[PDB]
Structure formats: structure tokens, C-alpha cells
Design a protein around this ligand. Structure first.
Ligand SMILES: [Cl-]
Ligand SMILES: [Cl-]
Ligand SMILES: [Cl-]
Ligand SMILES: [K+]
Ligand SMILES: [Mg+2]
Ligand SMILES: [Mg+2]
Ligand SMILES: [Mg+2]
Ligand SMILES: [Mg+2]
Ligand SMILES: [Mg+2]
Ligand SMILES: [Mg+2]
Ligand SMILES: [Mg+2]
Ligand SMILES: [Mg+2]
Ligand SMILES: [Mg+2]
Ligand SMILES: [Mg+2]
Ligand SMILES: [Mg+2]
Ligand SMILES: [Mg+2]
Ligand SMILES: [Mg+2]
Ligand SMILES: [Mg+2]
Ligand SMILES: [Mg+2]
Ligand SMILES: [Mg+2]
Ligand SMILES: [Mg+2]
Ligand SMILES: [Mg+2]
Ligand SMILES: [Mg+2]
Ligand SMILES: [Mg+2]
Ligand SMILES: [Mg+2]
Ligand SMILES: [Mg+2]
Ligand SMILES: [Mg+2]
Ligand SMILES: [Mg+2]
Ligand SMILES: [Mg+2]
Ligand SMILES: [Mg+2]
Ligand SMILES: [Mg+2]
Ligand SMILES: [Mg+2]
Ligand SMILES: [Mg+2]
Ligand SMILES: [Mg+2]
Ligand SMILES: [Mg+2]
Ligand SMILES: [Mg+2]
Ligand SMILES: [Mg+2]
Ligand SMILES: [Mg+2]
Ligand SMILES: [Mg+2]
Ligand SMILES: [Mg+2]
Ligand SMILES: [Mg+2]
Ligand SMILES: [Mg+2]
Ligand SMILES: [Mg+2]
Ligand SMILES: [Mg+2]
Ligand SMILES: [Mg+2]
Ligand SMILES: [Mg+2]
Ligand SMILES: [Mg+2]
Ligand SMILES: [Mg+2]
Ligand SMILES: [Mg+2]
Ligand SMILES: [Mg+2]
Ligand SMILES: [Mg+2]
Ligand SMILES: [Mg+2]
Ligand code: NA
Ligand code: NA
Ligand code: NA
Ligand code: NA
Ligand code: NA
Ligand code: NA
Ligand code: NA
Ligand code: NA
Ligand code: NA
Ligand code: NA
Ligand code: NA
Ligand code: NA
Ligand code: NA
Ligand code: NA
Ligand code: NA
Ligand code: NA
Ligand code: NA
Ligand code: NA
Ligand code: NA
Ligand code: NA
Ligand code: NA
Lengths: 237, 73, 56
RNA sequence: GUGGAAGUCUGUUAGAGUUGGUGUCCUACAAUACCCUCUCGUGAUCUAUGUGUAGGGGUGAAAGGCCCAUCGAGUCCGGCA
RNA sequence: GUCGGGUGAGAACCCCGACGGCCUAAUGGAUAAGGGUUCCUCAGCACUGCUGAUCAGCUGAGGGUUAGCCGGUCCUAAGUCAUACCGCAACUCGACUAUGACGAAAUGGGAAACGGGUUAAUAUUCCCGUGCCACUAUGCAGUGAAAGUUGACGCCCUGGGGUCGAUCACGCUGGGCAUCGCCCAGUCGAACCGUCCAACUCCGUGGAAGCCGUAAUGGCAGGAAGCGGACGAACGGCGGCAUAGGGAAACGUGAUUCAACCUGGGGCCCAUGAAAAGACGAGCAUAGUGUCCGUACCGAGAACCGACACAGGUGUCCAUGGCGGCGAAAGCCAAGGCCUGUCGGGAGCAACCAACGUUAGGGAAUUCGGCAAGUUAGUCCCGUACCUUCGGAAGAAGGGAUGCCUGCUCCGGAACGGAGCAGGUCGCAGUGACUCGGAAGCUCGGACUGUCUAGUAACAACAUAGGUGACCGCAAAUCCGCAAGGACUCGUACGGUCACUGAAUCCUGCCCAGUGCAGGUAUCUGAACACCUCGUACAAGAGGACGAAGGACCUGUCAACGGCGGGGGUCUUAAGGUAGCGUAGUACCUUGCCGCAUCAGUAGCGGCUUGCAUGAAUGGAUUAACCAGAGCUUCACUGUCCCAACGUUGGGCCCGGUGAACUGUACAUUCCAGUGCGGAGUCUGGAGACACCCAGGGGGAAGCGAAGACCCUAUGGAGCUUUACUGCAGGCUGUCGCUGAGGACUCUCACUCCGGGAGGAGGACACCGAUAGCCGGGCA
RNA sequence: CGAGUGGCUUGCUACCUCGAUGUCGGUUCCCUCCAUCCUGCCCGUGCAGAAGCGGGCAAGGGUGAGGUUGUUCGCCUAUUA
RNA sequence: ACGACCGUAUAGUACGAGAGGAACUACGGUUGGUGGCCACUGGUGUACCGGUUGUUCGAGAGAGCACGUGCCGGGUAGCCA
């Protein structure tokens, strides 16, 4: 049997790779020696082809010009600050410890220094619940209670572009255009429509999977399709 | 609105596109001063044609329900 | 559109050219590697034991 | 009234496609051609050039389709008498 | 093509002329790739040329391609390679990271050339004239100089500026025509230098509480109109260039519409639309230098790819030549090209065929089927059903008009633009050719555009938006690799992965028994090391204890595979078909029964329906819109048929020239019987038969073509499958080493990760090497 | 119940062809058989007539058109000697 | 190389209670088949004549092209049914 489509992806051929050369920049926080002195101005508001969300262009004191992840409510001319003693204003990036409890935050660091990792997409946000000298418990958009090093920086506010998901694509044409600007193969042929040779759900006199859809975690790649290690399925119950 | 879709697509698709584009094409109050000239420049990009105040907000809305909550806290 | 006669018409791309090293028209100008002598890939002349019979 | 949206319509504009004729041809003009007929025709559009993916591997809006007239595993030589 | 004539031993097809034609986004003009001398000249015809040849893309010999300002070079793109690093038994192999290099000749970016003249063949290259760019040198100025600007960028709508072209008015020059006074061509003049400035941005002035303004949007007391100013464009205008150039001559002037080019405004994205070198920023005189590579030609129904001088295929630019018209459409005509989509002569030219024309009366009787053909047609006015997701259905349907001539009207600045009026008048017919829909209805399918079997399937198959489930906090899920490493990822749950269902609408019942996945699990099962006894002076080996994942066992879960009966008024095996839908593209019985419809209807539709053997995301039903999708009906229409005829064009037939292939055990003028391995020209018996030839439509040679695809056989093959046999990756798990300090725990020093660092986080775990048990069609 | 004839059907058999004898239905065009549907001449009748019913000789000629179905078959219509 | 039918008279007769209802024979016609012919009706008739749309030869006159006639009207001979 030939390799299934999921295996082709792993090679990282052109068809599957993301259009990097077309992308703008990796949105990371600013590395400050210390002091918190670092502050800049919002020059413009652009659209990041990589996240479909907006982005803010900023110019600091020391000459630095770097595009940053634009939360909601930031405009041209405004002022942002990066550091330990930064003001608690929307957009200002600072460690979790300095941030008061119950405030919506985005672009949270998974480890201090990495430059952000959590809460980055359209209109999402984390939630700072607890404080300690050792821990800092954050509520990630998925609802999980992430325990974090209070030294990890995070931006105040919710990510802009909220409400994108709300309106349907309406037509194949529009989806096509979204996907072209991503490293995803599109469209998608259901494995049950393929031949016996091309995918486990293939073949048969009609369209149906011969094997039960759920499948073990331990299964080798090439067979790992369908409902993976499902803790259950359906909605009923 | 969705009058350009013809009879194709259905009620739910051309109705969810008519209202979401009906509130996207409305007079929006700008956060800088108070003039209702904010129009949609792009995906999430908002700008007021009066003072040129270009800013960030929801995709189709200049302000989202969760973006008004950041102010409180 | 047949792969035959009709698809012979587009064939006007250049590929294998006169290899500087061995002197054959086997220098793939898109790969810059010879199919015959191997010039461009190996410093050693491409040679295989199957270009002739086993006991020879 | 203005405005001029649209995987919108008409359409041998250009270009792309290939429904029926089971026509013509069927030691052809042609190892897939000719004619009339028909479909799309601002978009998931068509196209040139460059460039990437290689054989149990690619590539596949999936027909086991395509990868130089070669594919339910290309071609060359060898194993091989 | 025909008549002349030329050259020649030879002339249907080589050349001149006249007459006649074909090509119009191409059969014209310029080219990319590719070809490679095919280009020009001379001399030739043994070869090549679908006939011939005095011709040639052929044979032979000679000649031909000239650049600072056209290309290449240079720059960077997707990306490619080299060296270093690491991997590998290893390499000419392999991912990352550094560095360097490569990567665009029509068609990315880019310092600079125009007019004319000349050759058999080159030509912004040579010659004549004029101008321009760069570098160096010199001289003067300049002390500025790098910040900024440019290079430099999507799709749709649209305003203004405006050259060429075309057309109109008028004048001049030349030509054409000859009832009239019209008709055609021409009326030229570059780069460059200088000069002007519209739109946009901005300043002053001003001072609108309703004004200003647009095609449209819009503007404003945060200051509108108006007035003045700064900045500021065309390949545009104007002068120079130029008693240059070019023209037989005149060597114009105004206008409209305006491709090129210039410059604004508006809209759209779950799509955001290159980079670098370079240029500007930053003067001038004079002189010096500007090397190397291409440069002919074809660019296609004979120079390219397809074995061919192949009816095939092959990118760009010229889309503004006239009438016509909505038009880059038809059609007819220029300019230019051609008569080489290259064999000819003769016959009222038969039969037969191929394209096609017309056919009385009838009008789908033809037929699986209206297949094929036909019918309708453009524009305007009147008018328009059911149904509908309110978009549509719709150009529904149905009804009327349409020319030419005369004189006008209205809109606009106007058009050689449009809309209308009155009168007049010819035909069978006024969209007079051309161009140019047949309409209506019921049902099935998939919602829609879209996709697909290059080369018998274009659909109902795929896709799709929409829906649903699943996995995962990122040192993740999923996938590639032996490894070093890598895609996803310049990504972060409004995500990306994995699957199913397939628009909207109304809904989507019951079953966890089995199978699958997931969770738990007292006890039970469960490998190896270490630990114990036994044994062996050691070892083999016997036994004991402990026991991981896994399983037993329990729970969860069907929008997870899948199921939804028999019997009686419960049994198998968990439940026992709910809404719908129903003789279905599912119904064996079947042409089910009733009805509509027809003279007649295995068809179609509606109802009924016990459904052999329908049914809810294996999605059910319903449904507007769309469809080279499947079946049916009506009006219209017609040579489809009744039932054929006559015609046109190309063949066909006879003559000249050229000149293959298939196929061939032999004999062969057979026919009717018989007989034979049961399907005989060839045996047997009869009959018939003088030989040769032309034409025909194909009865026979079980005609020719292909060592039958159908069937079975072979201890044949391959692809695919699984709870077939045996394996293997891979995942999970114990144990060994890496590996250190004081059945549960602390710590840091190895090792890991983050961090630029200081340090931060994890920590003897993880990673990796070995072993052991479980799973294990992903693979063999 | 008994005796038979034909070779349309069906079945059985495996002789013939697997280096191929092109399928069913239809169409078209040609010769034939008789076990006669019509037409000609007869017989019997439960033969008044007319109209039929059964049988005999007889293959000259005829034996058509349409609706559903791919159908053969067959079902249906209207004509018909 | 002719097959068959309908009709008229025979006849409202024979026969029969009645209803109904023959034949021999003589005529005329239709249909299928067959052979031939073109005065007649019809088809064709890109021989011919006329009308007219577009365009080109300046107009006019007269002509070319519009697929082997632009389209339309008429149509001789002949060949035909
Ligand atoms: Cl998506
Ligand atoms: Cl060049
Ligand atoms: Cl404007
Ligand atoms: K056989
Ligand atoms: Mg990143
Ligand atoms: Mg979704
Ligand atoms: Mg992609
Ligand atoms: Mg799909
Ligand atoms: Mg399939
Ligand atoms: Mg499989
Ligand atoms: Mg299915
Ligand atoms: Mg299914
Ligand atoms: Mg369209
Ligand atoms: Mg045929
Ligand atoms: Mg390509
Ligand atoms: Mg298949
Ligand atoms: Mg080959
Ligand atoms: Mg092929
Ligand atoms: Mg030579
Ligand atoms: Mg020549
Ligand atoms: Mg010569
Ligand atoms: Mg280079
Ligand atoms: Mg260029
Ligand atoms: Mg030349
Ligand atoms: Mg040239
Ligand atoms: Mg030729
Ligand atoms: Mg007729
Ligand atoms: Mg019929
Ligand atoms: Mg048809
Ligand atoms: Mg006026
Ligand atoms: Mg017409
Ligand atoms: Mg469809
Ligand atoms: Mg095909
Ligand atoms: Mg199709
Ligand atoms: Mg087809
Ligand atoms: Mg589908
Ligand atoms: Mg979806
Ligand atoms: Mg989805
Ligand atoms: Mg029915
Ligand atoms: Mg259900
Ligand atoms: Mg004999
Ligand atoms: Mg065989
Ligand atoms: Mg078989
Ligand atoms: Mg096998
Ligand atoms: Mg690291
Ligand atoms: Mg196997
Ligand atoms: Mg046998
Ligand atoms: Mg035969
Ligand atoms: Mg008899
Ligand atoms: Mg009687
Ligand atoms: Mg007979
Ligand atoms: Mg003519
Ligand atoms: Na299957
Ligand atoms: Na309106
Ligand atoms: Na076609
Ligand atoms: Na292979
Ligand atoms: Na071999
Ligand atoms: Na100027
Ligand atoms: Na015109
Ligand atoms: Na010739
Ligand atoms: Na379409
Ligand atoms: Na379609
Ligand atoms: Na179960
Ligand atoms: Na279960
Ligand atoms: Na079921
Ligand atoms: Na006809
Ligand atoms: Na024969
Ligand atoms: Na196979
Ligand atoms: Na038999
Ligand atoms: Na044989
Ligand atoms: Na047949
Ligand atoms: Na007879
Ligand atoms: Na019948």
C-alpha cells in the first residue's frame, strides 16, 4: 500500500510547506537588559498574512523598529511600554507577577525569554487568576489552568480581530484563498472516497470505513487516522 | 449585503453575511475623539477618515464584547 | 490531448548539453551534472560494473 | 435617481474545455486527426518562463489518475543463459 | 487559376504582363524558445520535392552577421551548488548552521541614441548629421553627504490631462472618372535642449452656524466658498534642433472621439498583493577612456517538437486601417502577403459514396430515444403564471413594431451621438444577406460555480460552503529521517492536526450485548534483571518471592464499527424501526391495484402500500436556483418515416505522370447431395463449365487482423484484504548502562531545555545504547 | 393406456473450433418447408337461410399498420379475405 | 405477372313462422404486385428572369463576393411519382 496523505506532509515538500518567503515577521516580545525604560509609539496598523489578525508597527527610543502583536484598542499615535515597572495599560508587555489579578492578557510566555507562546490568535485571551512568589496560574483560552513562572512576560488585553470566526466563508472560492496563504494541503478528499491502496478507509463497494473509526494511541503512522484515542464520540449522553 | 449571492448558498449563509456586514458598514464612534467616521480598512484594521486615527478592534466590529471588558479591569 | 503526437509540440526546452569534461551531450544544464561522466557530481568519472556483463 | 456588487447572465473577443453526431478518418494528414454540434468564458480562471517533489517513491477537488506514445508500481543496464 | 509572352534541348506548375482569385488577430508586421548557415551570389539536377521543373529550404563552390548609449554583463526571486560543521561502515550520500557563489536575453529591477543614407546579403552596430550617459584626468566651484526620496509593486469601479490613429470642415499638390461632381493619395520632419502645469500636498488671506463639491463618495468653526502663494506631470504643448532630413508637388489650418503615456477619487480581503543592486539627495569647463560576448536567417499548413516539406502541437507584441454593428462578431474591402493548405488531362460527368440544396399531401407513424435535420432569432413597445431561500422564476408565455424618401422635434457643448414626430412611398418579405432562444409541463439526482478517467465513462462520482466528532498548552498533537536533523511554524486553541456528513429549511428515535477507543480496577493472570533455596568446588539446569504494560473484571462512549427480529397477550443477541419516506436508481412476486393520459401506454405521474430485503451525519425528509446528468407529456417544427425524386460540390470512370501495403502449403471454372475428427472448391456420386477482361455490391473461402479477454488447467505472476502462517518497523512497559549526593522522600554535579549574558527551569528523571513482555496488514 | 414422427424449445453428452467460426433483439434482402390463418376446389353436420362448427385436397399468391417493452415472447387498438 | 377485396343487378328474391337472407351469371371500382410512359397534376430544375439586404468598383449605368445560388419570387427542357 502507498503512503497515506498524512505521511507526505512529514517530508515537508513544497505542496505542504508554509509560504514563509511571503510572510512578514516573527512577533516576539522585546528583550530589555532591565530598568523597564523601554517605551515606543504606535506608527501603523497592518494585516499579518500568517495569522489573519492585525498587527501594530512600533518605534522605540533607541531607534528600534519592530512589528508587534496588536491587542484590541491600540491606535496610531499611542504609547506602549515594555518592562518590570510598566504601566497596567492595554498592550503594555510585562511579567505576570507585576500584573494584578483578574486582568485579560495575551501573548503569554511559556518560559521567560522565549517571547510569547500562548493566546495569540483572533480575539482570544488568557486570564490571570492567582499569584505567588513561586507560581502564577493562568487560564488559557482552551480553559486549561496553566501553572506559570511569574517571571514570564505577557501582554495586557485581548488579541484584536475578534469575531472573525463568526461569519461563514460562504463559498469555496474564499476558503481556497485563505488556504493558499498557509502551509496546508487543500481541498480534502475523504479517506473513504479513496481506493483500498490509498488509505485504510479506502475501497469497498460503497463508501464506508470497514474498520471502526476510533483508534489506539499506540498505532503506527500509516494507520493512525480517524477518531484518535477518542475518549468518546458523538454528543448523545 | 448578500444580494450579490443570488439564490445560491441558502438563508443561514447570506443572512449571517448581511448582518455581520450590516454592522461593519455602520457609523462607528471613534475612541480618539468622538466623530462617527471609522470605517473598515482591512481585516481588523480600523481607521477614522476624520482624524486619520488608525486603530485595532474586532474583525467586523470596531469593538468586541470581550474588548470592552479589558477597560474595566 | 494525447501524450503522443500532440504533446510532442511543446518540447523545446534545453536539458542535456555538451559536457565539458567527457565531451558528451549529457550535461543537464538545469542540474549542471552529466548523465554520462558524472562531472559536476563526482570528482571521479562515473562508472558502473553493470555497463557490461558480470564475468566481464 | 445615483452606485456598479457578482466563484452572475449572454457570448466561436481572446483563451480554456470536449456533449452528441456513435459523422468523416480507421495500412490516416494524425500511434488519439477533421468537420458541425456543445461547455466555461473576473476567477477554486487561463498562460509563458523559471523553479521544487523520484520509483513501493512523488503527485493526485480520488479516475488506481499522472510521473516523456511506458504505470494495480516509470525507464535503462545488470543479476540473466 | 486563364491568355499572352520570356529563358531553355526540354516548360501545366521557373520568370514578366493582363484578366481572375485567396488571406484580415491572419496566409500581414515584429519576435522568445528551438533549429544552425537553412540567409546572399554563381554554377548545377545523380539525390530531396506527393506529377514536372530550366525552380528550390536540394547538390557544389564562394560571400555574409561590424554597437559606450539593442541585448547579455550587473542586481536580487522561488530556489541551486560549493567550502566549513555534523551524520554515515562509507561515498559521487544526508537534514541544520555559517560563509561564498549561482539563479531573469520575449516577460522582474536597469546610467545613456534619435533622423536619414547605404548592401546581393548587416545595420538605433557601417556612413552623413545631431545628441546623450559613465568612469578617470585636469581646472574652478563645493565643503556640503546622510537623513530622506526613488528602485518598489493587489483586484474592481471611475474622473481629468493627452499624443498617434480615424472622421469631419476648408485650402494647396498629384492622380482617377466621364451625362453627373464625385472618388483616392499626399499635405512629413526625431532624439535632445529649453520652456509651460494640470491633479495631489501644503501656506497666507477669508470667516460660511448651512454653505462648498462630485460621475460617485463626500468637505467644514479642529475653519467651508472666494482670493493669493509655495511645491508639483506626460512618450503632452510651445521655441530651438532644422535655408538637418525627406518629398514628383504642396510642404495645411481648425475640430471631435481620443490607444500610448500622465495624474486623481472611490470600493474589496477569514486573500494585504517581491527583493536587491542601483538612482536621486549632491555644480560646471575641457580632454581621456568605454574592453568581452550575441548580431545571418526561420519563427512555421516546408527552417521549431511530432520518424515526413505531418490537416497535430508550440509564448509574447501589433485589438485604432474602411463600410457594418453593441462588438476585437458576421459579412464585404484596403495595406501587406499569396495562387506552395502544391500533380495533372477528358466524360451533362453512369452505378456507388462523401459534404449539401429543395421537395407535394401527411407531420414523430421513424426510433431504445425526435438520433439527424429543422423550428425560434437581433432591437422597441404592451405584457407575464406556479413556485420562491424574496435573490429568482423571467428574455416566463402571449401580443404589436422594424424599410426606403421629405421636412422636423427633444436630450447634449458637440459627435461623422442618442430618443422621437408628421407626411410621402415600393416588395411576397424591411433584424430583407449576415448576425440571430424553439416554448411549456410532471418526476428522479446532486444544493449551487467548480473537479475527473491525456487516449471509449463528464455523471448521480470528487470538491464545496455548511454540520458533527476526535487529538493536543506548544519540550504539544500529527507527520519525515538510519542518523545528524526536518515539515507543520515568521504558527499558539477565534489554532492545526485527524476523521466522517455535504448549502439553506424541519428534524436526526431506541441499542454499549459483541467489536473499537478511552478510564478504573480488591483480587486473578503477567517477561526479563536483581533478591532467595536447590544444584554444580564454577556453569548448565530445578524451584521460590516480587511483578510493569497488557488481559480478566467494572464504567464510559454510536454525528464509533455497526444493530433495530422470530414467537405470545417473552427467546436469540444489547434494543426491537420513532419523524419521514415507500412498487423507490431500494419491491423477488411485477406489467402489484385504482386513476390521469392514449384508439391502444411492461413507459411516465398521483394515490394506495403488509417495505422479498426503506429510515434518520452508514444521515431522513423537504426544497427555490443551477445542469452537454436520467425517464415522460403538449404546442410549435421538419424528408425521422409514408416513399422516394431531382439537384450541387469532391471522388468515383477513361488518359499522362508517380507508385506502396495487407496477404500467399499447393492445386483451384464450380454447383447439388453425400461422406469425413460430427461445418469440404480439392474425398464419393452426379450436374454444370470455351478462354480473357472491365465495373459492381460483398454470399462463401468457418475471408484478413490479434499464439481467446470468456472457461479450466499450472504444486504461474502481480495488486489488494483480514480475527490466514511467519515476521518487521512503530507505541506502550519492566529492567541494564549513561548515573552523582543524604516503598516513600530531599538535593546538585552529570545530562536536558530557555536565556545575549548573569542566570532561569528540569534533575539522576528525560534523552540515547541493550534487553524483556504486550500490541502491532503501517510494511514484508 | 398404448404406438410413433419432427428436431422450433428445454435438458443430457463433451465428438468439433480456445495461434478467436464476432452476442441477443432489430433491421434489410434472398431461396425454402407444410404440420394451411386467408384465398381455390371438396366432405360431414347437432347442414332451413345467413352465419358457423369438424374434417380432406392444396405451398400459386397473401399474411399489413400501430401503443408499453432492448426484448424474443407476449399484453393492447384500430383496420383486415 | 398477376393475387384479393367492395360495390351494382340477380333480390328484399330462394329458404324461413318471423327475424333474417343467399347463389349461378353480367357489370363497375379499389387494393397489393408488375411492366412502361411524361399530354395532364406535383417535385426538381445553384439553365433562365425578376425583388431585395450588406459591401466593393466615386455616383449612375453595369457588375463581383456573401459555400460552392446571399436571401426571396417565378420557373423551360429533362429526370421523376
Ligand atoms: Cl480554516
Ligand atoms: Cl538581443
Ligand atoms: Cl474625480
Ligand atoms: K472457440
Ligand atoms: Mg514564531
Ligand atoms: Mg468550522
Ligand atoms: Mg500551502
Ligand atoms: Mg471532502
Ligand atoms: Mg473510487
Ligand atoms: Mg490498507
Ligand atoms: Mg456515502
Ligand atoms: Mg459513510
Ligand atoms: Mg461567470
Ligand atoms: Mg456508426
Ligand atoms: Mg512550470
Ligand atoms: Mg476501481
Ligand atoms: Mg523515453
Ligand atoms: Mg504516459
Ligand atoms: Mg557553406
Ligand atoms: Mg534562398
Ligand atoms: Mg539558380
Ligand atoms: Mg548572477
Ligand atoms: Mg528586463
Ligand atoms: Mg534581412
Ligand atoms: Mg535580423
Ligand atoms: Mg507543403
Ligand atoms: Mg414534405
Ligand atoms: Mg412509436
Ligand atoms: Mg439533434
Ligand atoms: Mg441642444
Ligand atoms: Mg433569419
Ligand atoms: Mg452537480
Ligand atoms: Mg477519457
Ligand atoms: Mg460534464
Ligand atoms: Mg467523453
Ligand atoms: Mg461528493
Ligand atoms: Mg466544513
Ligand atoms: Mg468543519
Ligand atoms: Mg407507480
Ligand atoms: Mg441516530
Ligand atoms: Mg467432384
Ligand atoms: Mg492461447
Ligand atoms: Mg476469470
Ligand atoms: Mg501470488
Ligand atoms: Mg535550543
Ligand atoms: Mg501482505
Ligand atoms: Mg471436446
Ligand atoms: Mg466468417
Ligand atoms: Mg397436407
Ligand atoms: Mg349456410
Ligand atoms: Mg413457394
Ligand atoms: Mg456565388
Ligand atoms: Na472502505
Ligand atoms: Na438605490
Ligand atoms: Na467537438
Ligand atoms: Na518500480
Ligand atoms: Na535480465
Ligand atoms: Na517638454
Ligand atoms: Na469601425
Ligand atoms: Na504544382
Ligand atoms: Na462558472
Ligand atoms: Na458545472
Ligand atoms: Na456494544
Ligand atoms: Na462497548
Ligand atoms: Na438500517
Ligand atoms: Na432532404
Ligand atoms: Na465474397
Ligand atoms: Na496487480
Ligand atoms: Na439442444
Ligand atoms: Na481455428
Ligand atoms: Na441481430
Ligand atoms: Na399456398
Ligand atoms: Na408491440
Amino acid at each position: 500500500g502507498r503512503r497515506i496523505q498524512g505521511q507526505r506532509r512529514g517530508r515537508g515538500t513544497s505542496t505542504f510547506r508554509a509560504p514563509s518567503h511571503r510572510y512578514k515577521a516573527d512577533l516576539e516580545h522585546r528583550k530589555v537588559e532591565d530598568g523597564d525604560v523601554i517605551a515606543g509609539t504606535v506608527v501603523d496598523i497592518e494585516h499579518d498574512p500568517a495569522r489573519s489578525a492585525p498587527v501594530a508597527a512600533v518605534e522605540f527610543e533607541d531607534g528600534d523598529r519592530r512589528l508587534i502583536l496588536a491587542p484590541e484598542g491600540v491606535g496610531v499615535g499611542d504609547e506602549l511600554q515594555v518592562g518590570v515597572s510598566a504601566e497596567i495599560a492595554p498592550g503594555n508587555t510585562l511579567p505576570l507577577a507585576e500584573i494584578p489579578e483578574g486582568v485579560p492578557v495575551c501573548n503569554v510566555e511559556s518560559s521567560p525569554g522565549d517571547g510569547g507562546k500562548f493566546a495569540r490568535a483572533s480575539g482570544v485571551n488568557a486570564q490571570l487568576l492567582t499569584h505567588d512568589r513561586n507560581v502564577a496560574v493562568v487560564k488559557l483560552p482552551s480553559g486549561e489552568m496553566k501553572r506559570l513562572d511569574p517571571q514570564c512576560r505577557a501582554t495586557i488585553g485581548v488579541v484584536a480581530g475578534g469575531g472573525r470566526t463568526d461569519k461563514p466563508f460562504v463559498k469555496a472560492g474564499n476558503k481556497h484563498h485563505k488556504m493558499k496563504a498557509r502551509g496546508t494541503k487543500w481541498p480534502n478528499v475523504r479517506g473513504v472516497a479513496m481506493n483500498a491502496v490509498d488509505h485504510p478507509f479506502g475501497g469497498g463497494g460503497r463508501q464506508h470505513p470497514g474498520k471502526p473509526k476510533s483508534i489506539s494511541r499506540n498505532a503506527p503512522p500509516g494507520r493512525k487516522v480517524g477518531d484518535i484515542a477518542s475518549k468518546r464520540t458523538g454528543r448523545g449522553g | 449585503r448578500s444580494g450579490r449571492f443570488g439564490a445560491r448558498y441558502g438563508r443561514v449563509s447570506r443572512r449571517r453575511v448581511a448582518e455581520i456586514e450590516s454592522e461593519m458598514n455602520e457609523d462607528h464612534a471613534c475612541p480618539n475623539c468622538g466623530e462617527d467616521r471609522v470605517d473598515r480598512q482591512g481585516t481588523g484594521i480600523w481607521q477614522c477618515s476624520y482624524c486619520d486615527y488608525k486603530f485595532t478592534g474586532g474583525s467586523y466590529k470596531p469593538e468586541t464584547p470581550g474588548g470592552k471588558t479589558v477597560r474595566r479591569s | 490531448t494525447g501524450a503522443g503526437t500532440p504533446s510532442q509540440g511543446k518540447k523545446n526546452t534545453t536539458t542535456h548539453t555538451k559536457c565539458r569534461r567527457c565531451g558528451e551531450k549529457s550535461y543537464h544544464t538545469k542540474k549542471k551534472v552529466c548523465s554520462s561522466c558524472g562531472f559536476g557530481k563526482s570528482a571521479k568519472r562515473r562508472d558502473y560494473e553493470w555497463q557490461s556483463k558480470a564475468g566481464e
